[PDB]
Design a protein around this nucleic acid. Sequence first.
RNA 1: AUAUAUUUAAUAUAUUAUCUAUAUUAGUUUAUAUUUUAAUUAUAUAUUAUCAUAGUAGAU
RNA 2: UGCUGACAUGAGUAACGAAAAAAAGGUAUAAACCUUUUCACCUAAAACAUAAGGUUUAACUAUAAAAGUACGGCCCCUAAUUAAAUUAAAUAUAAAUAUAUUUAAGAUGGGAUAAUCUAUAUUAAUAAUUUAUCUUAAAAUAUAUAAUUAUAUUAUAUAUUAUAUAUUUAUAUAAUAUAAACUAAUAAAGAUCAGGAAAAUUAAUGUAUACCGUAAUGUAGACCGACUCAGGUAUGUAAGUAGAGAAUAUGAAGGUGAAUUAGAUAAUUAAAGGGAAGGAACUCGGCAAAGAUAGCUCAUAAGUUAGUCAAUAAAGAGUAAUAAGAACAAAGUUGUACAACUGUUUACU
Lengths: 146, 45, 157, 57, 112, 49, 204
Amino acid sequence: ARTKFTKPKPKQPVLPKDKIRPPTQLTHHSNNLRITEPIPPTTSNLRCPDDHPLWQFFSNKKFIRSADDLPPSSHIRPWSIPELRHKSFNDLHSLWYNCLREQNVLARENHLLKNIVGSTHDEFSELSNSIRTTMWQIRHVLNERE
Amino acid sequence: SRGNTYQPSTLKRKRTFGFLARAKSKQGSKILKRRKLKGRWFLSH
Amino acid sequence: DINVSEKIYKWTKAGIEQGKEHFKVGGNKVYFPKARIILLRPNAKHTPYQAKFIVPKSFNKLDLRDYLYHIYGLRAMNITTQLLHGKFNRMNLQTTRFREPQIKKMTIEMEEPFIWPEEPRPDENSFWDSTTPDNMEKYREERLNCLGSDANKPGTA
Amino acid sequence: LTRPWKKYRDGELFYGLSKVGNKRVPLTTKQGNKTMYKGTRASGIGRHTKFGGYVIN
Amino acid sequence: AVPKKKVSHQKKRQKLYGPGKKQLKMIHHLNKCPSCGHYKRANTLCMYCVGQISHIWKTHTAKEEIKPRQEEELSELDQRVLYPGRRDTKYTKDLKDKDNYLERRVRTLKKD
Amino acid sequence: SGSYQHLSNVGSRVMKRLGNRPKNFLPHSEKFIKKSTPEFMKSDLKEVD
Amino acid sequence: KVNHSISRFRPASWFEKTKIIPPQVYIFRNLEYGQVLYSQFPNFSQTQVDKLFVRPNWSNRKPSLRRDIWKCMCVVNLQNYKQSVHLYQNLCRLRYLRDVAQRKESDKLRKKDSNGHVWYSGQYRPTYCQEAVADLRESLLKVFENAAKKPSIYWEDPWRMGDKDKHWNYDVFNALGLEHKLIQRVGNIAREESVILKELAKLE
RNA sequence: AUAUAUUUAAUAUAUUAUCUAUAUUAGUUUAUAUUUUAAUUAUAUAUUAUCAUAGUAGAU
RNA sequence: UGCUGACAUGAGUAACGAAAAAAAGGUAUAAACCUUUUCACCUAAAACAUAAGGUUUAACUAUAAAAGUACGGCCCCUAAUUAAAUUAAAUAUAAAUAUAUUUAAGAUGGGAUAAUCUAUAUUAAUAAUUUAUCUUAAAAUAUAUAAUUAUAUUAUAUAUUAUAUAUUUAUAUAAUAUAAACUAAUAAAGAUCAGGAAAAUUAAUGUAUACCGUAAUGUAGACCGACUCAGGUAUGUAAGUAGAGAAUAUGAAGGUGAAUUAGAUAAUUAAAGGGAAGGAACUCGGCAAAGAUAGCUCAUAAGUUAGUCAAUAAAGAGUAAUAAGAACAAAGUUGUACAACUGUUUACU
Ligand SMILES: [Mg+2]
Ligand SMILES: [Mg+2]
Ligand SMILES: [Mg+2]
Ligand SMILES: [Mg+2]
Ligand SMILES: [Mg+2]
Ligand SMILES: [Mg+2]
Ligand SMILES: [Mg+2]
Ligand SMILES: [Mg+2]
Ligand SMILES: [Mg+2]
Ligand SMILES: [Mg+2]
Ligand SMILES: [Mg+2]
Ligand SMILES: [Mg+2]
Ligand SMILES: [Mg+2]
Ligand SMILES: [Mg+2]
Ligand SMILES: [Mg+2]
Ligand SMILES: [Mg+2]
Ligand SMILES: [Mg+2]
Ligand SMILES: [Mg+2]
Ligand SMILES: [Mg+2]
Ligand SMILES: [Mg+2]
Ligand SMILES: [Zn+2]
């Protein structure tokens, strides 16, 4: 520890002027740089495609299907098993895929309703259930045929 | 200074008291059966 | 010849050129998938070239990519998985603890930029008026957690 | 204060509604040692390597 | 160290409300405020008038709300894309409803 | 709400317990329910299973 | 043996001697905090990161080297190696200024959130990226002032650079061949990013 | 350096105000220090303050 | 000294848990929330990275992003060990079972390559217990008269320039270029206490890169302590100045100023500072509290089991210092009883 005694030794001979090397890089900065306000990215720069496949997750181009713009359960009816029974395999497959697609759009919407607004209306849920029923019927018919 | 006798480590606890440990040994099986008969909801860690 | 990454890239490019799959289709066919994916709104951190979905907990990254291509004709270039913690929730406090779902989300980078349609004004759409349910909740809370002379206190909700 | 509407010392927790609860509950991916791997019926796809990698089939 | 017996209703009453010291006095010392004839404590500035003055000062000596240069001409759509409004936690919500836990100064009666 | 409950079904046993409340203690829960609903939503008639 | 091409700051002379890549600067996003990291090469080590983030705090955290959360934002091709080097230096200087010397001024330009912190979603802060764009632009301008291959900025995303009007329409830029060609999405842009970068380099 | 008025033939002189004492590169891995190189990046300047048991001691 | 519930009494008493706050503005709503400025506190931490742990506590529901290279798990491989598992008749035993032997499991360990970026798959053939890196030698720098004296340097870690060979890309050579610390790799080598186990090469053909961990908290309000408990809790970095050091002082940066405030400071208590003349008269007993005239370099007796054991000896000196003047390391000599000695012991007398 430092005390009354303390003889501080010098640093170094710092290699006499002539002996040093020239620095590999000479000119560094721009000694004149201004701090300018940032430049936030704008959407005008984009060209969002109209027929972009992710629009297929919405009904038409619409955030939520309004209560008026939903198919009411008075009109909509799920597919019957017997009726399905006389349908080709390919057609059945197509139907299934359509159903799935519909569910996805409902599903997203349903999630939005539940998580954010916190609604309990459950029209979307009901629709999804109906779709699921149809799907299961289809599956049953497929099994049955085999 | 006593009091802090439980020093949690998930590995040790699953390995010693866990369902799989219980089910592997005959005594453990007895314990699980006992808990089932009592109707416990949780048969072991 | 050349190294692996480069080769992969080349393959992808070729696929794109063809107008088919930009990835090796697994020789493992499922005809009737019951899976569904939720399209989520984009976070501040996501670009317009990224979209993300809630997908099945048992969904593979590859599977998601495949699924998007086949069902929706969407080319997901890069996919990133994010499994979320289930937090303990409990209703009464006299009722048992249990964890909420482990939920799986996936971000995908596509070529073409998408943006969502702007959310409805709180009136034009019956469903997405977020106030009424909140009000109801508040009312319920008031009803439950008012004990004595707070019964007289005028309703907030 | 932790939360300014509760000034006085109540029976309130720093977070949540009860410290205790049933600990004997199915564990998820998030809990455990580094070595604890749970998995989610996602990959019986390929085969692990001798060195740590994964070769898809 | 410890009470030998349960202290009777009488005794406790007389210990508490008995002596003068322990009783709340009536605030006799209060008078009209020269600026608006409301009640105020004697030897004390009226809390309404002073508050008003402070408010006026604030309005005058208001600091310039340094709004950023970019965000002023930032398209609404663009803004939405950039900064989407999240859901706040319970705690945050609680904090926000200040009216619930925070008190605004009451106004006195008019002195006569 | 902000839950993700809809995407899962967890605490199945618990749900069953709370869903299938014994019918002799149905008066209890119903009373509480009645208490915690506005006058326009509530109805005097008893639900059927 | 130990020192790789990334290990040290590399001047123009070194580049000339080597000629690994064309004269350019790479700029990366932190994809999670929202920070931005400049570099003379398509890879980067700890040292560079350290240099960039000398005085971090709760708002400006020293980011990790987490391979995955560093995605390439910009690749700016110039004419001369020396020019590129200068640009890089300028960027660094700007960053330093933002951090320590003139932090207050920088703050006075950012977006806030009622409380008065810099606007965030999680720990992601948008402003840093914006600054990096603006800063980059400024650096470029400076370089051109100081000052045939036409210069170009290859963007991850067309969106990220504000607009062709307002900014990026200075006369100096116009006078030179400053182009704004977006990088090709085509394949995987995260996994096969290095390959893409290499390809780009080869192209020049 | 910038801002604001002045004189000069936006430029330079001088006045006032504000801000600035940094930073980058070399010297064989790292970190620090030194010296060079870069840069406007400084005073064996006056006066203060904080901390070190009231920092310690002499008076009070 | 019944049991359960309710409600009293002490009592509006004690306490509100190591503590530095102030103003202005949010907000004629704020001691306690947020922002700015001032002041302070921690700083080989109260910081920054992490492990474990846990009511997700986070900068949150629009949420913690990975083919891999100073990224971890799984996977391969085993240790300690474990396994109603495996050999007319493995052996033994009231049953349960136990045993040796195989097989499988089992991390806290081992596991190709890689910014001049890297490919693990399929088929065919035939390591390390600890510890030190001295002395010598070589060459270099100065004095003096090839040789002497004195000094530092001496195995590795890049960049630049100049050369010779394949043809600006390669190979090798020469010259140039600080200090004290640290790291890794190299070689050599001393001690007795003698220092893990386990999974081959070439050629041809290949590759679209799975799953999970990732917030924040982590010497703590987010773990274990019944509590937002002065306790317990693993690892790395830990700005300079100073110094032998991670001692001690400060503190650049970062973080923090708290579920009690405001006044008043009686008696009295705790934790400190000072004290004239005395100096153990106190007391069971100098308990407690004082008390350090270099921390570097010299110099250090008796006794002794010959070990500077005694020894950091006491005393004493050198440098510094002449009465005003940091913090931390460092507090005497001797006799006797008992026990050789370093150790261990009644977690909580
Ligand atoms: Mg206990
Ligand atoms: Mg055992
Ligand atoms: Mg606890
Ligand atoms: Mg954990
Ligand atoms: Mg990668
Ligand atoms: Mg201090
Ligand atoms: Mg009785
Ligand atoms: Mg009393
Ligand atoms: Mg008292
Ligand atoms: Mg008191
Ligand atoms: Mg306290
Ligand atoms: Mg205020
Ligand atoms: Mg230090
Ligand atoms: Mg931390
Ligand atoms: Mg094994
Ligand atoms: Mg504590
Ligand atoms: Mg006496
Ligand atoms: Mg005596
Ligand atoms: Mg001492
Ligand atoms: Mg002894
Ligand atoms: Zn008045």
